[PDB]
Amino acid sequence: PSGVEGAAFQSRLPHDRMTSQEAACFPDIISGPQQTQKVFLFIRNRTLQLWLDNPKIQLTFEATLQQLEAPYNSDTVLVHRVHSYLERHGLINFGIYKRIKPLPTKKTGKVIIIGSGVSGLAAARQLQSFGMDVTLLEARDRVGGRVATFRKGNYVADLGAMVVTGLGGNPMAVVSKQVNMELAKIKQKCPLYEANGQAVPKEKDEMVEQEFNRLLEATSYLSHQLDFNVLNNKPVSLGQALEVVIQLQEKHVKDEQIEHWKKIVKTQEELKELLNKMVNLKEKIKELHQQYKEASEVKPPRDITAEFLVKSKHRDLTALCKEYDELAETQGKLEEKLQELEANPPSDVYLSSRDRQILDWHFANLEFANATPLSTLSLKHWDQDDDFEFTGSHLTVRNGYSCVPVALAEGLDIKLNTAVRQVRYTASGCEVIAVNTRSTSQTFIYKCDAVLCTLPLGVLKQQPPAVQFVPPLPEWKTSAVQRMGFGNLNKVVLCFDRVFWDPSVNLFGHVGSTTASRGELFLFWNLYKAPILLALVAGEAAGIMENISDDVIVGRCLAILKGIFGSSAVPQPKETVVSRWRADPWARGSYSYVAAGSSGNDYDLMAQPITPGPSIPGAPQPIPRLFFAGEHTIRNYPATVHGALLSGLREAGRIADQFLGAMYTL
């Protein structure tokens, strides 16, 4: 889409309808006459367009009113309301832009941000862009959180997020214009190779893949058309659902051979009863022939009774000779059906032993996308975010996707090596209590109006708690934290000095010998300038390989590569890195997933901010003091860098609205 309508779509907004949020800021216009709505909707779409067409400079209200034209630029307050709404919730003037209007001399309100991950940084920048005092507290010695980027020599490789999922509606699209990102398209072609190190032939590779996709659909049928979502008081997972579907396909295969051969016995037995009619008829024809013989040897001249007896016996034998001929037509027919039926046997198996192993690879990569073993994904809700998918090719980042968080951190107050350890929120404000990660002795106290928590969900999940909330988080929040799922994924960075793989493939698979190890080193990526291959450890395999060292893991990678390219063709790597995200205590995993017995609604619970009790009992209902963002807090686009980024912009708007007031709602 192009024009002002493309701006709406590139901002994840319907161009022709007012959103639930815009209703809340403009409740006059939405209840108002349908014409004003179109005016408003144009003013919004146009302003989005202006921002989008150049996102390296601030879009001031004055600038916006200038490129508007009558009748739309008649009402200036409508334009000021719209511009400010957009500016507040980060639909314009977000990311890294040049300040037409430089900052206010004096800040208003003080807010602490736990975590310098993308979520964090994006809110931080917005709050500081709004003129608040912002400070970020970061346990790591670096920014970016789970967007990490190994760098040594001219070797570069993300240990963290590495894929941009398509620029059609993606806010990272704006950031890429703002920060140079060498963005390179992912060529989707992926050759699979088996254990022996030989490629799968295009016959299987397409047959199996198509079966996979068909199997997935099958579960959706089980889910939505048969309401197979609970089983023995527990919720059904995608894994179960897949097995049930596989078993029923293997059942139908047997059901099909049974009624096939039962069509054969029904015919063999029809033939058995036909032959006994034929033996017993032949034995009567044996006997009349003798009788007609015997009676034809009575040499004539005969009396008419013994003439009648020759003629009658002759009639009888030619009538029994007629029967036996018709019955041998009928045995010709039936003896031919058996030949055909035997020649058309139905399918021997559902899936061969090799077939099922290629299938496992399509499951592994499926588990690799969602970072968890399928046995955990909720069948009903695992693809709930599929509806908001972006358009366009998928991409990777040659210069290392750390360039973005680092870029965002410019200008911001960031305390690295600062492990937050207790969060204290009360009617009158908040205290954050951190230590120094190097000497855990040296203690820090931070006072502020509000705390924005971008602590990873794995950390919020931790028992016993790595961060203590005082007072405790209410049940409705802690329960949402147990229900949700925190996955795991890991990678192995292989740094060579030769390119020995096909430089035209971005990625190629390795098929695993069992179902139990389907995720163990199942996929490799040729992504970079340097000779770097990158190898995934997904599914159940992810958390198990974390209890093996680098060399051991590296040896298996060499092994698998040997198989596909020959023991000559692959040297020992110069530099090796292995990730352990479930091990890492500032992550405790890779990203969220929709666990069985969870739902999308928990992602909305994770965002609801916390409002403490009154200090003086009988005092008025205070302000909300504790705020949450991060990839686990954005129902529509979770487990993703953008989802983080957006949630950052979200809370920033919300906090500002709260401590700065929102004059645009009149």
Binding site: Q225, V244, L248, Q268, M278, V279, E307
Partner: protein, 133 residues
């Protein structure tokens, strides 16, 4: 609304496999056993029909009798009359057969015979006697 093509997922079937953890394998063992049973019951009858197939060697080609080709005259010799009366008593009312026996009278004359000479050959009685068997 309908499952993918080549996917077989019926409501009846799913409880089927999901009543207990071993039920999925347990059913699929039933069908493996049903298959092998029918499978040998084929080679049983395959061999039973193999024996009966051998008893019928030579067909019935020794026992064939050449085709008698008679132009069909309409005069009635006495010989042809006596042949008739005997065929009646042995054949009831299968005129075709009776026509086959006499050999030069088609089936219509047999029926006309039955009434013209009905009094004199006492047909009625002969039929009761043929009805008695």
């Amino acid at each position: 609304r309908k499952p993918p093509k080549g996917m077989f997922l019926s409501q009846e079937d799913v409880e089927a496999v999901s009543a207990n953890a071993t039920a999925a394998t347990t059913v699929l063992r039933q069908l493996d056993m049903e298959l092998v049973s029918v499978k040998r019951q084929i080679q049983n009858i395959k061999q039973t029909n193999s024996a009966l197939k051998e008893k019928l060697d030579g067909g019935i080609e020794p026992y064939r009798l050449p085709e008698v080709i008679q132009k069909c005259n309409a005069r009635w010799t006495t010989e042809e009359q006596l042949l008739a009366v005997q065929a009646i008593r042995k054949y009831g009312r299968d005129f075709q057969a009776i026509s086959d026996v006499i050999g030069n009278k088609s089936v219509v004359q047999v029926k006309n015979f039955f009434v013209n000479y009905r009094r004199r050959f006492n047909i009625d009685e002969v039929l009761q006697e043929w009805e008695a068997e």
